[PDB]
Symmetry: none
Subunit: 142 residues, 2 copies
């Protein structure tokens, strides 16, 4: 909750820091195995809500992010089913998800989402960074 919020807001900063504008475009300089260094998903939008960069293409995830949310700092929650939650990681969370599947394969998983607004800068346009924790809330205890 509070530690989730802080660690998610902290990952937003890492990506902001590592982001650059070259060739009239946004690029992020990330270590080789970023996906594996953290169980998070990041998206980066402009002041008008247009996607500029996605750690990956995640349809269900992109329809959950209400444009409204991009105009202010916030902590939200989105929902996915076990099947989508598992593609977010596609390692041992997989066994746990199978266990959720054994009792209810239509089970809903809740994911925390941090929205961070960055006012434009001399070397950086106004930007909105969105960070989604990929470990559902129902599996945190483990």
């Amino acid at each position: 909750d509070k530690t989730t919020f802080r660690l998610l807001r902290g990952e937003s900063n890492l990506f902001y820091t590592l982001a650059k504008w070259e060739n009239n475009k946004l690029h992020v300089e990330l270590p080789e195995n970023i996906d594996k260094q953290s169980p998070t998903m990041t998206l980066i939008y402009d002041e008008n809500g247009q996607l500029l960069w996605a750690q990956r293409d995640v349809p269900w995830l992109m329809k959950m992010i209400q444009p409204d949310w991009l105009k202010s700092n916030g902590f939200h929650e989105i929902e996915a089913d076990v099947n989508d939650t598992s593609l977010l990681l596609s390692h041992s969370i997989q066994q746990q998800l199978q266990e959720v599947r054994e009792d209810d394969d239509d089970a809903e998983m809740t994911h925390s989402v941090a929205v961070n607004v960055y006012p434009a800068t001399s070397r950086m346009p106004k930007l909105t960074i969105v960070v989604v924790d990929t470990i559902p809330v129902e599996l945190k205890s483990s």
Copy 2:
């Protein structure tokens, strides 16, 4: 265990975001943990507190890659990691065995060189021992 590393690596990304390279020197802004920052050759550039016994615990091999480790320490050394709140619990551990051994979680994170910073390795240590919550 797992969230332990995630919270330590969060304290690490913080220090990396506040960091700056000016006058050819690393510049660090002040954001239960202790942080140390090293360069590409594995030389210390900054320690949040100078704790000699801890530095000799950070195996140079660990600075090459991101990783999660554990280091042992007696009660005298663990209590030197805080200057002292938790100190009270440390006194009763000491009171029933001055040779008690303490474990501390250690997160190592590597940040590749870029166009605003050179390759760094930030090391974060959980100052509260594993067996004291």
